[PDB]
């Protein structure tokens, strides 16, 4: 979000989980969100 080294103390786990989850509602000749969950 800043194009610079991450500051010590960032909730990196929550950021990762939200970044992975947010576009889930968009996941559709494709396996899609069921494949994402299977993984």
């Amino acid at each position: 979000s800043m194009a610079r080294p991450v500051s010590i103390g960032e909730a990196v786990g929550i950021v990762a989980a939200q970044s992975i989850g947010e576009p889930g509602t968009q996941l559709t000749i494709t396996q899609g969100l069921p494949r994402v969950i299977e993984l």
């Binding site: 500051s7 010590i8 103390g9 960032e10």
Partner: protein
Amino acid sequence: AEPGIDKLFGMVDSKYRLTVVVAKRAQQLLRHGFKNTVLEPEERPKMQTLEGLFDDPNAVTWAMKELLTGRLVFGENLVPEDRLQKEMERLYPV
């Protein structure tokens, strides 16, 4: 965007450290009634009411501006806590 936010982020190894510094300084300002500020009278933040230019009541705005001026020193383990509190209340009594 807060004025000089890029320089304020440059000042610190962690944006969260910057935030803690700003908040503690604003607490200092509120507790001492701004009589401890490092801002010259021409540098004081102002707000526009119907009466005229008055001192900005936002101690956080004040503290960010002071941090930009750089007359504030920030860091860990600089002085005992009770010593800091008592010296500040001796210089600027409540």
